[PDB]
Amino acid sequence: MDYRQLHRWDLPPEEAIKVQNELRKKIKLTPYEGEPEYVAGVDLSFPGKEEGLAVIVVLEYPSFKILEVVSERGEITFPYIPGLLAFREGPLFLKAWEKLRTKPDVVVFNGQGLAHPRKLGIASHMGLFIEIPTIGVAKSRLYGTFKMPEDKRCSWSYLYDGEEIIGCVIRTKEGSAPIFVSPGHLMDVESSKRLIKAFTLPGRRIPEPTRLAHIYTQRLK
Ligand SMILES: [Ca+2]
Ligand SMILES: [Ca+2]
Ligand code: NA
Numbered sequence: 026m027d028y029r030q031l032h033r034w035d036l037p038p039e040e041a042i043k044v045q046n047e048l049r050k051k052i053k054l055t056p057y058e059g060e061p062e063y064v065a066g067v068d069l070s071f072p073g074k075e076e077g078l079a080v081i082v083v084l085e086y087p088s089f090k091i092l093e094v095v096s097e098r099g100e101i102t103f104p105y106i107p108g109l110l111a112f113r114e115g116p117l118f119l120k121a122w123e124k125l126r127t128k129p130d131v132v133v134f135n136g137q138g139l140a141h142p143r144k145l146g147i148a149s150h151m152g153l154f155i156e157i158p159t160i161g162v163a164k165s166r167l168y169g170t171f172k173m174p175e176d177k178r179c180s181w182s183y184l185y186d187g188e189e190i191i192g193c194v195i196r197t198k199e200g201s202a203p204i205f206v207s208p209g210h211l212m213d214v215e216s217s218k219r220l221i222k223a224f225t226l227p228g229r230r231i232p233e234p235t236r237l238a239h240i241y242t243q244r245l246k
Contacts, residue, residue: 060087063085064234066082066233097121134151146209161209179222
């Protein structure tokens with residue numbers, strides 16, 4: 026699948042932060058109206074240390090039938106730093122993306138989008154490259170404040186940066202920790218909440234696109 030390569034990846038952390046502060050200006054928080062037909066999820070594993078495997082799975086909606094899996098292996102060259110995840114995982118994701126034949130309507134990443142100290146988590150950053158609506162779904166908080174949702178399925182609360190809403194926290198599974206959902210690019214807070222709820226089956230904590238992408242990262246190892 027095609028994409029735009031907006032900048033080089035081999036930057037020191039200080040310069041990578043500056044890149045984020047320019048790219049954040051380019052995010053578009055627009056509603057996602059209607060229902061998608063094809064939904065992608067992305068996950069990464071590390072079979073060897075600093076050797077990565079990126080997997081993209083494309084699902085049909087609402088059936089969740091698997092339409093495509095792509096993967097790519099490569100060396101990891103940038104350390105994990107909270108807030109700079111894209112510089113670690115972005116390049117290998119894009120190598121998998123170039124192989125993709127099915128064009129998704131929405132892409133879900135393991136990580137934040139808007140809920141990020143510079144408003145450009147990996148989901149937002151990659152959204153700018155691929156120019157398709159994206160959503161970030163994370164298991165823990167990077168940035169923002171929130172009231173803990175009720176321990177009842179579908180309970181949610183907003184994530185705030187002061188008075189600004191940057192995402193939400195959703196109890197997708199009663200008795201389990203919630204998930205952190207934030208819009209990436211061409212997505213807004215209300216739409217990302219609605220879509221992730223639609224993608225998450227009752228009894229499961231994790232939405233089907235990234236749940237299945239994780240399954241394949243483990244199998245392909
Ligand atoms: Ca951790
Ligand atoms: Ca995983
Ligand atoms: Na991942």
